[PDB]
Ligand binder design. Structure first.
Ligand SMILES: [Cu+2]
Length: 128
C-alpha cells in the first residue's frame, strides 16, 4: 500500500529508522533519502545501500576503500541490490527498485557506506 519510505540521516550519524518493511504487493519500492544535518558530503556524507545481510560487511569494507568520487561504493559491486547516491547537508536523493529482486528465505540489510557510519547507520529490510 505504502510502497515508499522517507529516511533521514543526520550529523549524529543516525538514520531515523532501523527497520524497513516492503509490502509484497508493491511492484517497486522507493527510498527517499534526505540529510537534515549541517555538515558537508566530504565529512558527513550519507547514502542508502541495500544488500543481503551476508554481503553487508564486504560492501562496507570495499566501499570505504573506494573513496569519495565513487560515493564510497566499489564500482560494479555485484552485491549491491539498490542504492541512492551519496549526499551531504541539505541534499536529497531517491532510489526506486523492483521488489522482484528480493527473494523469500533471505535476510536483507540497508546501510550507509560513508567511512565509519555503518556502526550506527544500518538496519533491516524485510518483505511483508
Ligand atoms: Cu553516512
Amino acid at each position: 500500500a505504502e510502497c515508499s519510505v522517507d529516511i533521514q540521516g543526520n550529523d549524529q550519524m543516525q538514520f531515523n529508522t532501523n527497520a524497513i518493511t516492503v509490502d509484497k504487493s508493491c511492484k517497486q519500492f522507493t527510498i527517499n533519502l534526505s540529510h537534515p544535518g549541517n555538515l558537508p558530503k566530504n565529512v558527513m556524507g550519507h547514502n542508502w545501500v541495500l544488500s543481503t545481510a551476508a554481503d553487508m560487511q564486504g560492501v562496507v569494507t570495499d566501499g570505504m576503500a573506494s573513496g569519495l568520487d565513487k560515493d564510497y561504493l566499489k564500482p560494479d559491486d555485484s552485491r549491491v541490490i539498490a542504492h541512492t547516491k551519496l549526499i551531504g547537508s541539505g541534499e536529497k536523493d531517491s532510489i526506486t527498485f523492483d521488489v522482484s529482486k528480493l527473494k523469500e528465505g533471505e535476510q536483507f540489510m540497508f546501510f550507509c557506506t560513508f567511512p565509519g557510519h555503518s556502526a550506527l547507520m544500518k538496519g533491516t529490510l524485510t518483505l511483508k
